[PDB]
Enzyme design. Sequence first.
Site, PDB file in Angstrom:
ATOM      1  N   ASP A   1       0.759  -1.243   0.000  1.00 16.45           N
ATOM      2  CA  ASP A   1       0.000   0.000   0.000  1.00 16.45           C
ATOM      3  C   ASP A   1       0.797   1.305   0.000  1.00 16.45           C
ATOM      4  O   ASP A   1       1.376   1.697   1.010  1.00 16.45           O
ATOM      5  CB  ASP A   1      -0.890   0.084   1.240  1.00 16.45           C
ATOM      6  CG  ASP A   1      -1.876   1.234   1.173  1.00 16.45           C
ATOM      7  OD1 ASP A   1      -1.639   2.174   0.387  1.00 16.45           O
ATOM      8  OD2 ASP A   1      -2.884   1.195   1.908  1.00 16.45           O
ATOM      9  N   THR A   2       0.801   1.977  -1.148  1.00 16.35           N
ATOM     10  CA  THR A   2       1.504   3.248  -1.316  1.00 16.35           C
ATOM     11  C   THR A   2       0.839   4.383  -0.527  1.00 16.35           C
ATOM     12  O   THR A   2       1.412   5.462  -0.377  1.00 16.35           O
ATOM     13  CB  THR A   2       1.541   3.654  -2.791  1.00 16.35           C
ATOM     14  OG1 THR A   2       0.224   3.532  -3.343  1.00 16.35           O
ATOM     15  CG2 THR A   2       2.501   2.774  -3.570  1.00 16.35           C
ATOM     16  N   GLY A   3      -0.371   4.132  -0.034  1.00 14.42           N
ATOM     17  CA  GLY A   3      -1.092   5.134   0.729  1.00 14.42           C
ATOM     18  C   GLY A   3      -0.905   4.997   2.229  1.00 14.42           C
ATOM     19  O   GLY A   3      -1.581   5.669   3.006  1.00 14.42           O
TER      20      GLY A   3
END
Lengths: 99, 99
Positions: free
Chosen positions: B25-27
């Site tokens: 997850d880049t978030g």
Amino acid sequence: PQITLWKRPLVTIKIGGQLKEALLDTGADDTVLEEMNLPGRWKPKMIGGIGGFIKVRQYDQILIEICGHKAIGTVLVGPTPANIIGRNLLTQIGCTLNF
Amino acid sequence: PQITLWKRPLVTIKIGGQLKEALLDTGADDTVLEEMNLPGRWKPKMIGGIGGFIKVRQYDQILIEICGHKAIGTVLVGPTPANIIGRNLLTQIGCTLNF
């Protein structure tokens, strides 16, 4: 283009004629933006994550330019801390992960 | 390697000697895993997102193999719906975004 991840992956987006900052998030199925005013009709629907559920408004066929690339899809509007660009839109601009 | 985003970006990870499924997850700034037992000492700390805040336990210097690539860093343990691999670890395996 390419984007490392040492910092939050923030990009410039244009939606509803306004400029905003949004997070490219591979961990989000959908795209949720903070409070703003959009076109046609909508429906309730709820999204979850860490903590609890929040109420959002669903808008379809919404145009949106991310980092300068055109795209049309569903956008959610509710009480979110940040603007989130999910996989529904990350696919249109051909965004992939690499390592 | 490369990973499109038409489906949730799930990978196999090995931590504490057990095999688990986790989301790249880049978030997420940090990495948070579901309930499991880890090494040394920890501290409280809280993380937020959509909805509300949840309590997590912080563990440092934790080894973790993602999709087969070695990495050592901080891992969080709490009441999360899924296993999340954040940017703290996505950088070690040289994971970048591309479009």
